[PDB]
Amino acid sequence: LYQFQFQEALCQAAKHEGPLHKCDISNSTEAGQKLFNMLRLGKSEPWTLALENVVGAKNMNVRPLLNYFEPLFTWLKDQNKNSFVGWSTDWSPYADQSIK
Amino acid sequence: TIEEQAKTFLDKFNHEAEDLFYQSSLASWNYNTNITEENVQNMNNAGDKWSAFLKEQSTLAQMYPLQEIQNLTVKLQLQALQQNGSSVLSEDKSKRLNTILNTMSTIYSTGKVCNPDNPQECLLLEPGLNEIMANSLDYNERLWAWESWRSEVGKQLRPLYEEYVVLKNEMARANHYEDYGDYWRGDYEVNGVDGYDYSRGQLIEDVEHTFEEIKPLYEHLHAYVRAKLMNAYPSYISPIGCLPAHLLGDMWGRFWTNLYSLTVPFGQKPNIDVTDAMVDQAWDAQRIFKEAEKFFVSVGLPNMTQGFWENSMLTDPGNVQKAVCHPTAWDLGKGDFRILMCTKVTMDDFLTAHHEMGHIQYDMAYAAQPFLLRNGANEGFHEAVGEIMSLSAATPKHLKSIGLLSPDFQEDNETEINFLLKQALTIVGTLPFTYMLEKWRWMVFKGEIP
Amino acid sequence: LNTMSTIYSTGKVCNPDNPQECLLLEPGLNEIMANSLDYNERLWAWESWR
Numbered sequence: 001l002y003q004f005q006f007q008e009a010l011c012q013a014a015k016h017e018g019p020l021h022k023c024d025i026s027n028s029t030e031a032g033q034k035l036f037n038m039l040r041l042g043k044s045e046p047w048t049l050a051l052e053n054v055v056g057a058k059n060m061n062v063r064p065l066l067n068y069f070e071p072l073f074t075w076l077k078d079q080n081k082n083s084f085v086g087w088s089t090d091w092s093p094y095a096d097q098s099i100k
Numbered sequence: 101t102i103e104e105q106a107k108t109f110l111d112k113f114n115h116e117a118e119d120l121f122y123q124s125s126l127a128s129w130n131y132n133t134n135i136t137e138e139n140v141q142n143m144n145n146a147g148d149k150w151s152a153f154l155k156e157q158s159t160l161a162q163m164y165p166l167q168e169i170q171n172l173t174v175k176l177q178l179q180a181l182q183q184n185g186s187s188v189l190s191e192d193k194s195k196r197l198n199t200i201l202n203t204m205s206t207i208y209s210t211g212k213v214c215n216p217d218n219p220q221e222c223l224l225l226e227p228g229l230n231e232i233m234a235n236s237l238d239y240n241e242r243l244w245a246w247e248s249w250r251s252e253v254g255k256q257l258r259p260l261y262e263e264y265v266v267l268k269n270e271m272a273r274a275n276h277y278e279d280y281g282d283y284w285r286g287d288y289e290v291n292g293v294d295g296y297d298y299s300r301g302q303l304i305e306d307v308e309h310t311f312e313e314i315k316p317l318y319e320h321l322h323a324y325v326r327a328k329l330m331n332a333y334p335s336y337i338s339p340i341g342c343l344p345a346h347l348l349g350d351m352w353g354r355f356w357t358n359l360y361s362l363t364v365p366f367g368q369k370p371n372i373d374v375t376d377a378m379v380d381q382a383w384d385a386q387r388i389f390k391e392a393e394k395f396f397v398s399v400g401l402p403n404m405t406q407g408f409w410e411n412s413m414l415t416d417p418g419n420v421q422k423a424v425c426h427p428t429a430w431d432l433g434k435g436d437f438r439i440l441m442c443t444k445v446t447m448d449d450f451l452t453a454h455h456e457m458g459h460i461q462y463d464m465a466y467a468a469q470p471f472l473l474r475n476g477a478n479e480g481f482h483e484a485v486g487e488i489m490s491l492s493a494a495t496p497k498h499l500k501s502i503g504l505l506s507p508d509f510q511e512d513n514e515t516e517i518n519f520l521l522k523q524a525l526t527i528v529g530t531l532p533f534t535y536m537l538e539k540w541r542w543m544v545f546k547g548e549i550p
Numbered sequence: 551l552n553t554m555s556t557i558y559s560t561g562k563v564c565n566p567d568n569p570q571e572c573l574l575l576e577p578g579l580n581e582i583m584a585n586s587l588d589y590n591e592r593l594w595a596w597e598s599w600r
């Protein structure tokens with residue numbers, strides 16, 4: 001989870017435009033300091049404060065992870081139209097040759 | 101008072117901790133980069149001479165009462181020493197705990213299964229069963245491997261795990277924890293900062309709450325993979341059921357990566373690989389590291405230090421000097437950072453270079469902290485910076501700039517889907533397995549499951 | 551013929567209490583049977599080979 005929060009808070013500081021999965025941090029010193037002043041803390045601070053010093057929040061978030069996979073999500077919702085999305089927990093591979 | 105005394109004690113501690121740590125790490129490095137029976141015992145001598153100093157200094161510090169200090173960077177270090185660990189256990193119990201741990205580890209390492217038709221060819225797990233489970237495409241062979249591992253080896257570990265939970269629960273309750281799971285969750289706890297607190301009970305709610313937004317995407321992934329496996333194994337997979345557990349790429353289903361060949365969305369368009377363009381431009385395992393360092397220095401972080409270039413093992417030694425080179429970074433102390441890895445000129449090493457150098461760049465940043473306050477903010481922070489450094493360096497907009505991937509290369513919106521699906525098979529495919537496993541273990545370290 | 555010969559050469563038996571240490575015939579079972587003086591150990595070797 002952190003792996004994506006970090007990134008979504010970084011190229012949002014490198015002024016990215018396109019989808020998340022294309023952002024590159026290179027050549028953006030203003031996105032270096034924003035990361036550097038979290039690295040030089042070690043364990044001398046609560047991890048909540050350290051996360052605050054980059055993301056701007058205090059908790060695990062799943063929204064950046066979902067924003068990373070948005071194109072794939074739409075393409076899948078398209079490819080899964082003629083199918084059953086979900087599963088049933090009663091079928092089993094050996095249930096048709098069992099005797100009760 | 102009590103404060104000045106504690107501060108002086110930590111001061112006196114740091115010197116010896118630093119020096120002994122340096123020498124022990126030097127021993128372990130010299131052993132790792134040079135596998136010689138000479139160095140084994142030497143590394144063991146250094147290791148024990150560090151372990152003993154740690155135990156002694158820990159008991160010598162059990163006297164300072166905790167809830168009297170107000171300096172946070174002092175309470176933080178003291179809390180790391182007073183941690184009793186497994187000492188509080190009785191003597192004979194601690195010895196049986198160690199015996200159990202070593203037995204389980206060596207059963208896993210040396211267990212082996214063998215054919216029903218030729219009982220004189222047995223396979224270990226690492227080379228031989230992992231290979232079947234990763235490569236094969238035969239239903240019955242996969243089922244045989246999957247079942248034999250769990251029947252020949254998993255049945256030996258039942259009686260041992262039963263005793264392991266009891267002893268660990270004792271060790272945990274003798275340190276004012278509810279159970280062992282509550283002891284493990286104690287890495288995310290924050291205490292007394294007025295706005296940033298965090299309790300060991302909140303972690304459960306946070307992961308159960310984050311795992312709700314993932315099910316909508318994980319079940320579309322699941323449905324797509326099932327509809328694609330219903331073509332490689334016809335008649336074996338119900339179109340509305342679950343997926344049989346032995347057809348998931350590896351032995352436990354932890355990662356879904358090895359399903360790529362079966363489920364690639366646009367099978368004719370190729371991936372982005374620059375191995376060729378690297379050999380053609382004459383790249384050895386020394387230019388890739390200057391490239392990584394240049395990438396890092398672009399963003400603002402500092403350079404590398406000479407000792408890194410001198411002492412490092414960037415390349416495989418090749419000759420009789422053997423050295424296990426699972427890629428790693430090392431922070432020996434006092435200013436000696438160095439990586440050890442046998443770089444082959446491919447792409448999947450151009451990435452591990454960035455990963456490991458990100459580890460290093462983390463370490464060089466907090467190197468001005470007290471010896472016990474040199475780690476990630478918690479346990480999940482360290483690999484999560486290696487990951488983002490490795491993730492930003494594999495994008496065509498970067499490769500196009502560093503020289504590879506000749507400029508007239510248009511990325512189609514189909515290779516983008518190819519890449520995102522290769523990514524989601526290891527990131528998203530593994531979140532439910534992780535969640536389910538830790539949930540089960542938290543519940544059995546509570547007697548919640550008889 | 552080759553199957554029988556190689557079964558004899560590479561067959562191995564292993565302990566009932568530690569199934570991860572198997573012994574071949576030439577070094578390891580011949581040694582037990584030639585040196586040991588324990589009734590139960592000899593019986594175990596004799597029976598497991600056959």
Ligand SMILES: *[C@@H]1O[C@H](CO)[C@@H](O[C@@H]2O[C@H](CO)[C@@H](O)[C@H](O)[C@H]2NC(C)=O)[C@H](O)[C@H]1NC(C)=O
Nearest residue numbers: 130131133134135136137138139140417421422
């Ligand atoms: C690997 O370790 C061996 C010993 O464990 C090293 O051998 C020593 O090498 C130095 C210099 O080459 C000699 O002065 C010693 O006499 C050697 N000792 C022995 C027992 O042979 C060897 O040098 C190490 N490899 C490298 C590359 O440093």
Ligand SMILES: *[C@@H]1O[C@H](CO)[C@@H](O[C@@H]2O[C@H](CO)[C@@H](O)[C@H](O)[C@H]2NC(C)=O)[C@H](O)[C@H]1NC(C)=O
Nearest residue numbers: 107108110111170171172173174175468469470
């Ligand atoms: C906690 O104690 C440390 C001492 O280890 C204090 O840090 C010192 O602060 C003074 C004040 O300027 C500096 O001159 C020293 O160089 C600092 N020492 C170190 C090792 O950094 C710290 O101030 C104390 N905490 C609080 C909140 O006062």
Ligand SMILES: *[C@@H]1O[C@H](CO)[C@@H](O[C@@H]2O[C@H](CO)[C@@H](O)[C@H](O)[C@H]2NC(C)=O)[C@H](O)[C@H]1NC(C)=O
Nearest residue numbers: 162163181182183184185187188189274275276
């Ligand atoms: C660590 O373990 C010891 C006992 O193994 C705990 O008990 C203290 O031990 C010291 C040893 O000299 C005594 O002086 C104290 O009186 C003991 N305290 C109590 C309440 O019995 C010690 O509390 C443990 N520390 C932690 C942090 O759990």
Ligand SMILES: *[C@@H]1O[C@H](CO)[C@@H](O[C@@H]2O[C@H](CO)[C@@H](O)[C@H](O)[C@H]2NC(C)=O)[C@H](O)[C@H]1NC(C)=O
Nearest residue numbers: 024025026027028398497498499500501502503
């Ligand atoms: C970061 O910026 C520098 C300069 O702003 C880029 O370096 C130039 O790159 C172009 C094409 O790659 C070359 O034609 C120039 O000669 C380069 N100039 C220098 C001084 O190196 C660099 O490519 C940028 N990095 C990325 C990843 O785009």
Ligand SMILES: *[C@@H]1O[C@H](CO)[C@@H](O[C@@H]2O[C@H](CO)[C@@H](O)[C@H](O)[C@H]2NC(C)=O)[C@H](O)[C@H]1NC(C)=O
Nearest residue numbers: 071074075078365366512513514515516517518
């Ligand atoms: C990649 O882009 C192409 C070009 O837009 C997409 O192809 C078009 O998709 C739209 C969406 O329904 C159709 O209306 C057009 O008829 C398509 N054009 C052609 C020539 O077939 C394509 O769909 C995109 N890739 C994916 C995976 O959607």
Ligand SMILES: *[C@@H]1O[C@H](CO)[C@@H](O)[C@H](O)[C@H]1NC(C)=O
Nearest residue numbers: 390393394397401402403404
């Ligand atoms: C970093 O090292 C390169 C050579 O490897 C050098 O050209 C550059 O000046 C160094 N950085 C700084 C800030 O001096």
Ligand SMILES: [Zn+2]
Nearest residue numbers: 455459483486
């Ligand atoms: Zn790593």
